[PDB]
Ligand binder design. Structure first.
Ligand code: CL
Ligand code: CL
Ligand code: CL
Ligand code: ZN
Ligand code: ZN
Ligand code: ZN
Ligand code: ZN
Ligand code: ZN
Ligand code: ZN
Ligand code: ZN
Ligand code: ZN
Ligand code: ZN
Lengths: 412, 412
C-alpha cells in the first residue's frame, strides 16, 4: 500500500484472506495505535505481554505503530488519517487503545467511522471469569460466553429527529395520511431498521464460530414477541441460516428433545432462542446453558454489559469489532482523562483483548496462556488500583503489573 | 354504573378520587378477579392474607367478584366483559390474577386492552429482598427499588412493518427521498416515538411516589448518548419535571455536592440520571445508591426483569399498572395452566401484589405487615415447592402457605 507519514516495517509478513479463510504467517505485521490518555500506558503493557506469549510458542509479532486521536491531529492535522485506516485495510488485524471524541462529534464517532470504512459488522465479546477478580455473584466461575452483536443497524443507527422539527413533523403527518397511525405531535422520533442481510451475516459468523470452536450451542436473543417484524425477524432469519446453510451441524431445540431424546450428539450444535428481557435472569441462574449468543444491536449491548458485571465489570472487558477477514481489537472501556496520574490504571482489559486478537489469528494456545497468566497474577495479590478495592493491602503500578504477568507466562 | 351479569356488594363504600387524591374509607369495595389457571389458587390466598392485615389495622375490604378469561367467556361470551372494566372504573382499584391470552390475538392482549381502555400508563414494580429466598448474588438485602416504566410508547407500541410489505417499502423510500437516509429494502421497520406528554406523566408520578414514601432518589435511565432525540429527550423532560414542578424537593447531583457537601438533607430528593446499559453493573455493585427508578418502556422492562433476577426472580414479583387515581394490581407471572387446582403454586407474588395495592390506598402499615409476614414465613423455611427446590424446608401447599403468613401477621 502507499503510506504517507509512516512506512510499514521491513521485517514483517502480511496476513492474507482468500475464500473466507484467513492465512496467517509466523511473523505477521500487525498495526496498533496507543490512542488517547490511558492508551499510552495500557497498550505498551499489552504489547510486552503479547511479545512474551508470542516468543513462548515460537512465533513473533512485528508491530506497526500507526496513529489516531491527538497524536494524529498533531501529526496529520486529522484525528483518523488515511494511513491508519489503510494499515488495517492492508494488514487486517489491529490492536487499538481507546479514543477521545473531539469537541464537535457524536458519542464514539471515530470508532463509528472505523467500523464503517472497514465494514466491521460484528461486535464480538468474550465473557469469562478469572479467579481472584472480585465478583458480586456467588458463582462467576460458571460464566463462559461469546457474544456476537450485530453492530450496523437497529435503533443505534442514529436515524431519528427531535420533537417539533420539520423532519419529525413530516414523518408523523406522513404516517397519519398514509397508514392511519397516530403519533402524538410533541414526540421525538426514531426508526428501527433490521435487515435480512445484516442479521444473516452476524448469525452466520456466530454459527461458524460455534462449529469451529465446538461450542455446544448458539442462542438467538430477541424481543420478537412484542416486536414481530424487527426482533421477530432476527429470530426467523437466524433460524433460516441454521436450517438452510448449516443443516449438517445445526438442530433446533424441538429437534433436540423429540428426535434426540434430549441427548446432545457429538458434532451437532443446538440453535435456540430466548426472549431478550428474560436473558438477564438466564445468565444468573442457568449460566451453565449458554455458550455462543447472537443478538441485535441494542440487546447485544445490554446483555453483554450485564454479563461483564457478573465477571468483574466492564473495566476489565475485552472487545472486538470484526468483519470479513478483518478485525480491530480494543477494550470495551473509555480513555479516562485523569487516571490518578500516570502508571496507575489497569492494563488487564487491554492485555485480554490482546489475547482475543491471538484467538482470531489462530494462535489460541497463546491466548489461553495469557488468560492463565493474567489469572495467576491477580490471584497472587499483585493488582493495580481498581482490584485493590476488594482485596486491600497489596498495590503495584501499570508497568509493574504487566511485568508480573510476563513473569507468570514464561513460567510454564 | 350498570352491571349486566353481576352486582356490586351491599355493604361497602367507593374509594373516591378528588383533587389529586384517593379518598379511601375503612370499608372500600375493591373488585378482583381470579383470572386463568393459577389464578383460582393464588388470588384466594392473597385475599386470606389481605383480610387478616386489614382487620388487624381496623379496616375491611368489601370484595367484588368480577370475571375475565375463560370464566368470563363461559359466563358472558366475552373474555373481558363490560362489567369487569366498569367495576374497575367505578371502584378505582382492583386486584387480578393472570390471564392467558386466548388462541391468536394482540399478545399479552387481555392485559393490554385493560390498560388501554382504563388508560393505565405506568407500570410500577417494587423490587426488594425477602430473607430466605434463594439469590444468585452476594448482597441481596441491599436491593430496594421501585421501578416506574412508561408503558404506552417506545418500540413496544408496535408501530412496525414487515420486510418488503408495501407499507415498509413506502416508508423506506420516503426516508431516502425526503431525509437522505438510505435504509436497506430487505429491512423490517419499526418506529420509536417518545413524547413530552407520556414522559412527564411517568416522571411526575415517580417523583410524587418518592416524596410520599421518603425515598432518597429518582434515577432517570436512558441511552441518550446514542439516541439523542428519543431517550435523550426522556432524560431532559424528566429533569424539566424535577426542576419546574418539584423545585422545593429535587436537587441534582451537582447541587448535592455544591450545596450540601455530599450529605443529603432529609426531605431533599436527589434526581440523577444514568446510561441504561451501565445500569446492570450499577444495580449489582452500587445497589444501595438506587431507589426510585424512572425509565421508558423497553429499558423499564429489561431493567426491572434484571432486578427481579437479583432477588429471587420473576416468579415472586409483585406488579402494578397505574393511571390517574386508578390502579390494577397483578403479579408479574403468567397463569401456568399445568398446575391449575393442585394447591401447589407459590402465592407470594399475589400476596405481595395485595401489599402493593394496600400502599396505593394509603394503608402503608398493613402493607409493611404483609411483607414482614411473608419473610418470617419463608425464613422459617415454610415454603411452597418452588423455593423448596433450592432451599429445602417444609414443602407446603398454597393454602397452608397463606395460613402461615396469617399466623405470622397476627404475632406482630
Ligand atoms: Cl459501552
Ligand atoms: Cl359484554
Ligand atoms: Cl415479562
Ligand atoms: Zn460456584
Ligand atoms: Zn433471503
Ligand atoms: Zn426465507
Ligand atoms: Zn454498553
Ligand atoms: Zn513504578
Ligand atoms: Zn377507622
Ligand atoms: Zn416543554
Ligand atoms: Zn419483561
Ligand atoms: Zn422438606
Amino acid at each position: 500500500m502507499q503510506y504517507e507519514k509512516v512506512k510499514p516495517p521491513e521485517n514483517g509478513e502480511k496476513i492474507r484472506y482468500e475464500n473466507g479463510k484467513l492465512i496467517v504467517p509466523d511473523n505477521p505485521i500487525i498495526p496498533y495505535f496507543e490512542g488517547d490518555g490511558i492508551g499510552k500506558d495500557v497498550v505498551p503493557a499489552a504489547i510486552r505481554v503479547l511479545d512474551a506469549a508470542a516468543d513462548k510458542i515460537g512465533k513473533e509479532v512485528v508491530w506497526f505503530q500507526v496513529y489516531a486521536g491527538e497524536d494524529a491531529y498533531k501529526l496529520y492535522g486529522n484525528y483518523l488519517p488515511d494511513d491508519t485506516l489503510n494499515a488495517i485495510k492492508e494488514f487486517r488485524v489491529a490492536l487499538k487503545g481507546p479514543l477521545t471524541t473531539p469537541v464537535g462529534g457524536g458519542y464514539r464517532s471515530l470508532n463509528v467511522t472505523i467500523r464503517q470504512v472497514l465494514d466491521l459488522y460484528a461486535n464480538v465479546r468474550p465473557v469469562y471469569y478469572l479467579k481472584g477478580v472480585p465478583s458480586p455473584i456467588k458463582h462467576p466461575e460458571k460464566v463462559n460466553f461469546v457474544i456476537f452483536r450485530e453492530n450496523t443497524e437497529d435503533v443505534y443507527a442514529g436515524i431519528e429527529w427531535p420533537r417539533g422539527s420539520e423532519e419529525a413533523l413530516k414523518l408523523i403527518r406522513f404516517l397519519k395520511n398514509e397508514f392511519g397511525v397516530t403519533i402524538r405531535e410533541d414526540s421525538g422520533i426514531g426508526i428501527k431498521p433490521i435487515s435480512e442481510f445484516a442479521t444473516k451475516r452476524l448469525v452466520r459468523m456466530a454459527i461458524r464460530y460455534a462449529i469451529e470452536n465446538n461450542r455446544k450451542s448458539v442462542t438467538l436473543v430477541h424481543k420478537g414477541n412484542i416486536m414481530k417484524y424487527t426482533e421477530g425477524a432476527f429470530r426467523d432469519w437466524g433460524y433460516e441460516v441454521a436450517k438452510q446453510e448449516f443443516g449438517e451441524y445445526c438442530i433446533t431445540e424441538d429437534e433436540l428433545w423429540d428426535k434426540y431424546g434430549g441427548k446432545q450428539p457429538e458434532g451437532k450444535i443446538v440453535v435456540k432462542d430466548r426472549i431478550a428481557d428474560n436473558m438477564f435472569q438466564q445468565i444468573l441462574t442457568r449460566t451453565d446453558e449458554y455458550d455462543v449468543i447472537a443478538l441485535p444491536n441494542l440487546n447485544g449491548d445490554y446483555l453483554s454489559d450485564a454479563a461483564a458485571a457478573l465477571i468483574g465489570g466492564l473495566g476489565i472487558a475485552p472487545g472486538s469489532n470484526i468483519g470479513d477477514g478483518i478485525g480491530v481489537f480494543e477494550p470495551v472501556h473509555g480513555s479516562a482523562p485523569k487516571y490518578a496520574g500516570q502508571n496507575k490504571v489497569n492494563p488487564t482489559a487491554e492485555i485480554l483483548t490482546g489475547a482475543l486478537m491471538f484467538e482470531y489469528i489462530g494462535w489460541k494456545d497463546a491466548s489461553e496462556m495469557i488468560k492463565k497468566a493474567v489469572e495467576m497474577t491477580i490471584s497472587s495479590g499483585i493488582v493495580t488500583y481498581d482490584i485493590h478495592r476488594h482485596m486491600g493491602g497489596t498495590k503495584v503500578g501499570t508497568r509493574e503489573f504487566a511485568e508480573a504477568v510476563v513473569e507468570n507466562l514464561q513460567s510454564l
